Amino acid sequence: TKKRRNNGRAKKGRGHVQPIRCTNCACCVPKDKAIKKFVIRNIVEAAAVRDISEVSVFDAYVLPKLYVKLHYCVSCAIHSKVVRNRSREARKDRTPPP
Amino acid sequence: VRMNVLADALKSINNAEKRGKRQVLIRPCSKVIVRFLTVMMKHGYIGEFEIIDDHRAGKIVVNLTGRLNKCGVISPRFDVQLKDLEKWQNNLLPSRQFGFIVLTTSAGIMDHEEARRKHTGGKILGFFF
Amino acid sequence: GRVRTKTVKKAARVIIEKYYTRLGNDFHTNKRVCEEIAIIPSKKLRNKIAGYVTHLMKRIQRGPVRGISIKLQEEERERRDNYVPEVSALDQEIIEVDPDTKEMLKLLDFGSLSNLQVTQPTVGMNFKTPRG
Amino acid sequence: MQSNAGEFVDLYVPRKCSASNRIIGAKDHASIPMNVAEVDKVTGRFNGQSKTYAICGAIRRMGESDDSILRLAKSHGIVSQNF
Amino acid sequence: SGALDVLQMKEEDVLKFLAAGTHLGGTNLDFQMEQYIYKRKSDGIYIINLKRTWEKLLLAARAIVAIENPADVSVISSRNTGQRAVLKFAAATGATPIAGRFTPGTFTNQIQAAFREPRLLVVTDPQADHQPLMEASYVNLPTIALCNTDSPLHYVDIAIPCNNKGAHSVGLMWWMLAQEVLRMRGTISREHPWEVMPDLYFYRDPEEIEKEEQAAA
Amino acid sequence: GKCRGLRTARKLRSHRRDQKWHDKQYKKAHLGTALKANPFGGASHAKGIVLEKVGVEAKQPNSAIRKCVRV
Amino acid sequence: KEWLPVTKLGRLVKDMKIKSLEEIYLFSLPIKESEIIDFCLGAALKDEVLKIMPVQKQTRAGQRTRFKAFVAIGDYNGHVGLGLKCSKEVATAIRGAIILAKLSIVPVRRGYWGNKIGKPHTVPCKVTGRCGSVLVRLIPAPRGTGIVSAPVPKKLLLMAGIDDCYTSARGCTATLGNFAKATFDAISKTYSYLTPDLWKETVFTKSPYQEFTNHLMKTHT
Amino acid sequence: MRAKWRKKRMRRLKRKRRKMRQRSK
RNA sequence: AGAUACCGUCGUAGUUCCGACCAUAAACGAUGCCGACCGGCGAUGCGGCGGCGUUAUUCCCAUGACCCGCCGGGCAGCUUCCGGGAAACCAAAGUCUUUGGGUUCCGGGGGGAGUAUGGUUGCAAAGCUGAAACUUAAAGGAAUUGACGGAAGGGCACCACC
């Protein structure tokens, strides 16, 4: 039976979209199909930002971030708990969880 | 493309009856539609219409009552003999009390009742009950 | 460990519905009230019921309760039925009017009233939250 | 209804929607005969007579019942022709 | 209600609609509420036509006067703003109030203690009081509904276009209606301006109760 | 049917004729491969010479020897 | 057996004040009291159990065998009710379905095949009724035909008082509940069908709630 | 058997049938 | 255990380009095309039309960038007792026993079988066309309830842990 109206992707009037390699695997997944995360992240978490500002050459040097876009296959995204099985109603909720 | 102007009109008034609209617009007018509509009106399944006259295939605004159960076409136009008309009205009309097969005879477009009196069959147009 | 069961709470909310007037904050009276106004086969259950009666009596004297109805709420149904304030906020002489709220009144017989105040309309036709 | 004798033989004649002319079924439970009270022309008070409209449930769940009382009222000059 | 100067929109009546702001509709518009609007403002607020507001409240009042036994016109409001206005209207008109928490099956289920079986509903908001509209379907109940431009007209049989969001505009549209149903019965006279005050029907914010206490100390 | 036109008798008939072969009860009867394989050759009954007596095992649910004859 | 009526509509029936259930059917009033039909059509009303259909829900340790009883009811002149009740014991299902049938009873319209002499015998038009895949179609038939139908929808049309009827069923009619309902939805849509006889504009007579508003205040709380 | 591998068995067996029928012509 | 597998290190044809062949995919929206009609809403892409005001070329005019609509086609989305459907779901899968707008292709229980055979296309691989004997009482669809999971969560317990 049909589980998702979009067939679990986001091509509508295309026919073909270029496959990307998964970051965890290297499974060739269509760009629209892939679970995508744009994680903006500090080069140090919380345990080192205290230690580096103290031992800086520069006063008022904001510690720069690390910009990585993560592409996932569905088997990597669910196994690493990025996405998650939802109830048949809750599936349709396209609002990203805050 | 549009290959039965009568069929695309009878359905248009039928969808409006199913919905409960008080009057319906039917974009292409033919003498065949007007003659079909006038036959429904003399039996009183529609209120008075008016053909809007452009320098083209005119339009019609039919004032709908809520008397019309279904208005349906027969395509193609099966030629009907009087000995075969009873078999048509067996399996096209609900009861032998009400409902009318109109069919285009030589004596003009008219219901099967008027087409019986004149003892003259012809090509079936559609029906309404 | 001490949660009242429905048997205690139903007996409580019906005793305070009916015999409200006899009851009050004091436990030891409305312990002994239950001996006259019910047939309870247990001493332990009598105290449970009478205990949650006093807990509801401190609630009822403070405000309305979800699962109760008495004649003092019927009296305060009548009290707040007669809150007559100082003259209302509708009997004003300056009621602010948009040019377009004037246009629809101009079409009516109420063209210009002496006690209206027409303003200039808000420039920047800008009334939607952006998407995301 | 009639036979050859002419006598009405069926056991009840159903009502018929005042908006769309469609007869109201024996179990159309969303049907509503509503009395619009008649006001005295010069007093502005209730006469004792009513302007009765029956609307079938297929209109109410379509969202067209309060447009069609508004038309049935203005057809009977309850609502102003100006409106 | 039409061509009758006795049921004319009185000169006092407009300035109450303008003060309370019952003309002042929603941001977006329902397709069946398009007939109750003059114009859309620059700064997208839909101006409700107060003439066509008045013509419906008169039609709604006729619906309630036409009910002989006044008890069984069950009056309903779930939101903050109407709970007071309905309990006033029920005593004022002689109707039955349901102010806050309409239990599902109070019209359908026989064995419920609150098996009310009315002849007419009056509703503060379709989108808020959506529940009694779906039992107004199951038992042969005509609906009256105080409606707004962004509100849907599903199952509602006579609808008054209002600002049923606004604080005072709810109570005012109840006050206007409580009066008119009495005027037509012949309790109130159309000569004398009515004793009962429109402020009586307004929802009192418990924040303003603790502030009015120290202002009137 | 699909093609309704007043002058469409040869397609409706030839379609019905072509698609009748996809019926099992038809193609079995109207190709003589069934009749060529039928040991009776279309006969209701037939006579034959008994040449041994076979004890046929029944199907799994019903375990018993069905005493048949090779004719 | 006293029966103190719960509903407003029920009270009028017990006081012999609303005197025909055609006055109930006219105003589309839901009949929630069972002992209204036991009053009007009471002893004229025949019970035949169509079927006992044992249903099962798989639980942790075995199946819970509930019994679905289908009762068709009706006096052999104007009224039928198809009631179904799923109980745990078989006797309760029958008693439950008899009650649920009576609540569900409809008036069947009956007309004439062609010539219009005597008392009516057949369906007034070509009604259809379908639930599930089962499409049931009833057709008017001449006097003395009997019901040309399957034994079960025949069993309802006999109860309805339709003496003559051609039928043409379609779909999985071996599943009875669908076939019993589908035929019931056909003889529910007889009075719902707008024939030119029913073109005379409605003269809206007074509702029994409005007629007896003087009595529905004082005979109870 | 996967319908694809069922199909691949036929295309190896059809391939050997053609082989034998070339040897006899 | 085996591991001619998954994992790892290498690596042939291939992957790239030019020119010919092949004609198949879950080539899927598993949904033929043309036309008519039947609810709502907010978006979006494109063109056009009109309408306060901000901004740029500032020095205006006309133009871009926003903003508020309207219209036409377009990919879509949500919404509902239009209606349909076995249901899942579908404004199309609706307008269907109240059965006919036009037309094309194609199905007839499951296997045997896309097999054998013949024809045909191709260098080959194979493509197109395509049986029968025989076998079999089911195969299958949707949904429900349980049970199970080397799925995800939320509990409880000194017959669990700390």
Author numbering:
A (entry chain b): 2 to 99
B (entry chain X): 2 to 130
C (entry chain S): 2 to 133
D (entry chain W): 1 to 83
E (entry chain B): 2 to 218
F (entry chain Y): 2 to 72
G (entry chain D): 58 to 278
H (entry chain An): 1 to 25
Show sentences the authors wrote.
This family of viruses employs non‐coding RNA sequences, called internal ribosomal entry sites (IRESs), to precisely exploit the host machinery for viral protein production. The IAPV‐IRES found in the intergenic region of the IAPV virus belongs to the well‐characterized type IV family of viral IRESs. Using cryo‐EM, we comprehensively characterized how the intergenic IRES of IAPV, a virus of the Dicistrovirideae family and a causing agent of the colony collapse disorder (CCD), binds and manipulates ribosomes to redirect them toward the production of viral proteins.
The majority of particles populated a class where the 40S subunit exhibits a small degree of intersubunit rotation (approx. 1°) compared with the unrotated, canonical configuration. The IAPV‐IRES maintains a similar global conformation as in the binary complex with 40S, but in the 80S map, both the L1.1 region and the tip of the SL‐III show good density as their dynamics are restricted by specific contacts with elements of the 60S: The L1 stalk stabilizes the L1.1 region and the A site finger and the ribosomal protein uL16 the SL‐III. The coaxial unit SL‐III/ASL‐like domain of the IAPV‐IRES functionally mimics an A/P‐tRNA priming the 80S for eEF2 recruitment, effectively bypassing the initiation stage.
